[PDB]
Design a protein around this nucleic acid. Sequence first.
RNA 1: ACACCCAGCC
Lengths: 114, 85, 138, 144, 97, 222
Amino acid sequence: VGIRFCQECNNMLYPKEDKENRILLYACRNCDYQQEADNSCIYVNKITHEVDELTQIIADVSQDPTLPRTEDHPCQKCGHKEAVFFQSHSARAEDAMRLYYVCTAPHCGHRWTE
Amino acid sequence: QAPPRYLLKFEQIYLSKPTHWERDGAPSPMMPNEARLRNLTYSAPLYVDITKTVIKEGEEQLQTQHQKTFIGKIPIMLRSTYCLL
Amino acid sequence: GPSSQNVTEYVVRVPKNTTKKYNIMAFNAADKVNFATWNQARLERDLSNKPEDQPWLLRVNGKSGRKFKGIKKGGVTENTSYYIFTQCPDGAFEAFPVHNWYNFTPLARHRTLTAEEAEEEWERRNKVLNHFSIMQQR
Amino acid sequence: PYIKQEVPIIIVFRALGFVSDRDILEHIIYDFEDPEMMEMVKPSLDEAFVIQEQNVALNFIGSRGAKPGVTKEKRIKYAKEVLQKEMLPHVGVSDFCETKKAYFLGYMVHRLLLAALGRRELDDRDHYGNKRLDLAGPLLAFLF
Amino acid sequence: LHNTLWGMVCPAETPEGHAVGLVKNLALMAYISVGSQPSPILEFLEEWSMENLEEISPAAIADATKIFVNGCWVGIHKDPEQLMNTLRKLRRQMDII
Amino acid sequence: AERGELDLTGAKQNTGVWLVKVPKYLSQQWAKASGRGEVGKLRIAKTQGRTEVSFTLNEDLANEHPFVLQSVGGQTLTVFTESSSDKLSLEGIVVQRAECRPAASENYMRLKRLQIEESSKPVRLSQQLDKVVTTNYKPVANHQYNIEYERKKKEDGKRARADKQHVLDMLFSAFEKHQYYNLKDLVDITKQPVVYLKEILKEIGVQNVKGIHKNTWELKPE
RNA sequence: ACACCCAGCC
Ligand SMILES: [Zn+2]
Ligand SMILES: [Zn+2]
């Protein structure tokens, strides 16, 4: 996890290890730049449902005329008594017909599931 | 290019009413019923304005203009803005 | 203090004819260049054409410093305009129209893979190993 | 268009005049903090390692054109012409419409990655908003 | 019979046989646009609070909304709803749109 | 000191300039002033926690434009200069970006309509004729180009047959000038009848077959 | 002829 580039030729960094010190080095495979890593991560894969749609919905979705509105689920932060609820329709799950709610107040848009 | 250099430019398109040329060569307005009966084609002449210029090493440019040069006939949809109806 | 409620109003001036041309310049945010090191520069037209309709090619500090290449802006200033307010001792702004927008990009100086030897090594479509050894032979 | 076999996308991007991968991924990827798309585009960069500069990328494009030929400059010119006048003509035909084409190709790859991740639905050939109707006007214009 | 044929194509009028579904008929109020030049739209958008592609860092695209005209990415805009309301007002008032 | 050197005094002074985007009408008005010296004024006010910027148009020029500031850290905007002496200098760096918008909302759309009307003046669309055109293909005794060509042909006349020695002298000048030749160009240079040229060339010259373009004559006697 | 439409009945 975490992608960043070298400052010399601005190409993709790659992991590498040295035998003298035994420390991870994110070195540029193109140029001759090296740097010390700070996470000890290379390849994180997520097989089950870790999409975290709560942080993926754009808060401006509330002002879409085609979405339903409800008053039984008030906003937690600003306390507005109107919200817009919708489902996900994303692949890799094809299930979990759950509702994601977005507050319709301007200068707001806290997303919450329930 | 052959020394002279000839340049032709097509600028303006004109398009008259549908017309028919009989054996005499006399143009007359083609009425759509007449086209249906006599198996004609309901088409209007298409005229274009052309500018011809010649470039010579002696700087003797001409700007001659062939106005409304006939370049064929376009079939005309009935009851459109360019029909007789 | 005076800076909290500073009041400033200077007169704008637009000359008609100016013997020297202007152009907008903008590096990329990630270039991270320095201007003190730019002791010498050479801004000449590229030789790849073989004049006014060709790109430039910046060469900084000869072969020691970095080189840059760029292109004119695709858009045209038919509706938009760019003016620069140059500071002067008398304080009157002098708005100056520009002629072109330029964007040079960084280029790295190192032994580069050639097209012919690239074709030669293309046989190793995915069988290639030891990426350092690719450049070591050359 | 006018190339008889597939080309990796990073080669096309490099041919458009963007060498450093930072510039490539600043067009394909708009949000830095999104590891999934970065991981999904890793293979595209890994395949394009051997191609390192604009002119060699142009050679890559041109070597697989209509004619192999003999010399280099001719198919460098051929690749430049096919990327300037035949690849996405609707965004740019002029000589220096390269940044716009780069952004559009980046948007295309971004849409592909979004579809792969499942963040968008694949489009339908029938959503009748994706179909245009050539009437007498456009058809007669096509002949004329 | 796709869902998007509502009001544009008759759901009933098709031939039966080898051409079923492929040959359709316009709805009774369907109108097909003859097209228009996208120039005035582009001039208005540039005059409005829109920033062109070449004048922006790539980092700003993520938060802003993209503007496509006739399928061509023209630039980006930071306030989408204001632009949408203004454009709809112009179209409804038979202005340049 | 060199022709291609870029002067960087402006950068060392950290001079900050303003980049302002203005519509077409303001720029056209400023251009119409013919560089009189002044075209307007700019008013910048600073409150306890906000900054207001505006441009006041000169009353003489006409016979209030609020300004909006954008982010600066997205790109590094600078400006350079090129002069007639091929001397490159850097004026400075842009420190703030400005956007100019018209205060008017509804009435300014009328000016937009006028601008669109002006922009649609030179675009051309086909016209319609009430009567069929009959001025073309007008009868004529002969075409102008044809009579011109006959006049030229009768002023110049036919190329006159000459004695063998003088045509041979042109041939000698010819293969002194260039080793190889094409039959047409030789005819043009010598200005001699084609059958007579062939007769006087076959005696001394021979035809060499080539696999590149066509067989051709050789002016060398051997 | 040939070709292309349209149409009928399953
Ligand atoms: Zn590197
Ligand atoms: Zn809320």
